[PDB]
Fold this protein.
Amino acid sequence: SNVQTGAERMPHDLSHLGFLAGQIGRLITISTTPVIAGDSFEMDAVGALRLSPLRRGLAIDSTVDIFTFYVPHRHVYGEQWIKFMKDGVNAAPLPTVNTTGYIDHAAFLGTINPDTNKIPKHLFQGYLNIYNNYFKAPWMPDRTEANPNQLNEDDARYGFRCCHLKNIWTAPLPPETELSRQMTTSTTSIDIMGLQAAYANLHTDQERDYFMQRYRDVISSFGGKTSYDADNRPLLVMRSNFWASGYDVDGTDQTSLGQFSGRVQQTYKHSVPRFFVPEHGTMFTLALVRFPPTATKEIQYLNAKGALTYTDIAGDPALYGNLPPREISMKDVFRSGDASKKFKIAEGQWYRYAPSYVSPAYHLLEGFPFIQEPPSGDLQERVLIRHHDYDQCFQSVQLLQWNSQVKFNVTVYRNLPTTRDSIMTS
Amino acid sequence: TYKHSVPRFFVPEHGTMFTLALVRFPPTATKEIQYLNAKGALTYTDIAGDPALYGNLPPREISMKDVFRSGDASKKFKIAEGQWYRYAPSYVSPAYHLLEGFPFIQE
Amino acid sequence: RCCHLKNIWTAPLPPETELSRQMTTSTTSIDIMGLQAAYANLHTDQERDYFMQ
Amino acid sequence: RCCHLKNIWTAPLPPETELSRQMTTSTTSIDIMGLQAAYANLHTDQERDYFMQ
Amino acid sequence: TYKHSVPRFFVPEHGTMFTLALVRFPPTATKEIQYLNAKGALTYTDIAGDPALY
Amino acid sequence: SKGKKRSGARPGRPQPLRGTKGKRKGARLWYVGGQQF
Amino acid sequence: SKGKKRSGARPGRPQPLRGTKGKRKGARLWYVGGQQF
């Protein structure tokens, strides 16, 4: 009888809808699709972004980010792949991972939880690779769970916490920078040629602390290049950003005459141009919603430290360009800050940055997404976003803090037989 | 606002003309999963997308448990081989489950 | 009642499609000309199941 | 040591090529749809032996 | 007299460049025979060159 | 990082979603045994 | 494989090697304290 060995190249629809929801400052998966080696991928996403109804009207916009990444299966399975592909049919099946038994767990991966509490390993591990290479601070430790059921709630139902927009206290120098370095000398002598060699060792250490925490950064400084296969990192295909706006509604009865309520609704588009898929893998699409980091109790540095010295106030170029970094506390920038929490800044940074001012009359007032109290804990706890800081800004609904409805217009050019060829023997 | 227009039609014998209406929604369900994410362990036939294998195999029989969270394993139906690479389902977040408005299929 | 818009589970193959078909052979032999005629009978059956009810 | 220039005896087929392949049948019957699926498994094996090591 | 020329090549990472040589002869043997002259009795499959059989 | 850094805001109103699939059609997908409306 | 498949035979006679190094000069390499011939 007739045996088919090849196919022709045709476009495939693969379009679907998007009823999404999430929290603020957490990275959640929006869409996912498998691809084959040799394909071409295209996507237009058109939708609307809404926030929960506000308590008093629109005051500050929020910014929204959409990302698309490509993750090969060889980056996840490694050597179990390759052997799988070389053996062809009759190869051993690929492994899975375990999840907690609920419906809303494994929702940060953009799927409903199966009744068996098992999902493909490449879905979970492909999310960890994106977070560890692009979204955590380079000086933080990596995250390695091996099983989605080892996470807690708010990590399984919603994504992982991300970082605030850069600021004086949300973007400090890494907690490993050295404020001094010693050189061993004799009792009544010093080698001045070895002193010259001690400055060259410190220069390489300071570069590896401010710019070059990752291997791909070290190679780039020499003038070289690394492919994402050499580093085993995902490939960023597209990125979009916008601000979300809306309007107000006026109350008209006896009690609410003079009261307003804000309604955020924004139309957006995420477009990915044609992309050649070199190996089997997955495409991820993710979203992130954030606010500018405004706090009600922040003060200017020169107004908070006690007595002004020449180094603070003069702005002398010979002094700012030759001094080590300065270590300060949370008490120097916040009214109720803790004096035992320290971080390091650059000298003269108070003449390069200006903070926002919030009047004392705004303290503890509903609506108005601010940070009411100075953040507590170690450095990593302060830099990451706490979505409980925005609970008093919205009204309680079932759809969390933001929701979206989107149509994904995907198109892939594959080499597959038609449905007719698959069901007919001859 | 709509319009239904019928051009001139020659009636050859005695009879009746009927006019009928039908209103529908797209079939979106809150508990639908992708086939490759729901079946357990991926084999070469599932994942490779090989043309020599999809074009020469018989149709595959699956259950409602393979596409739904609370589906029944004793309900079977047949699909074409490789149909999971030709079709994409809609995704509804778990936060939408059992919420008024929003015409979905809850179970 | 009418039918849903077509879908993976709302538009399956008819519940009468055959997943296999046998041919009678001998104990230690097979007629290869009759095998060719068995594929032509199956082709007509599959057309009457997918397109031609 | 390296390889000779290609020749009738210096370039033979790999020593793992199969000269036959069996399919399990019944005593007095054969599934002709499963026979079609047995040829597609052999095609992938022969490609991985001649071109795709 | 020979020449081996390598055009300009951008080195992306630290490494080594190797250069190697290999010298060979065509594989001629003194005792090789044609296949049809060495196998014993010629059958239809050996000699006819029929496209439907090969 | 690599290659995107684009933008996506549009003006107007968020019209309701119309049709679950369809941007460009390929070949047939479903075979029931005839026409079905 | 990748990108070469070139050829290299030239006609003539194999002249003896003349000078161990030198195709294109850069900066100085050796410092003895003066000129040395």
In short: The longest strand of chain B covers residues 60-63. Helices of chain B lie at 35-38, 44-47, 51-54. Chain B touches chain F through seven residues (CB under 8 Å).
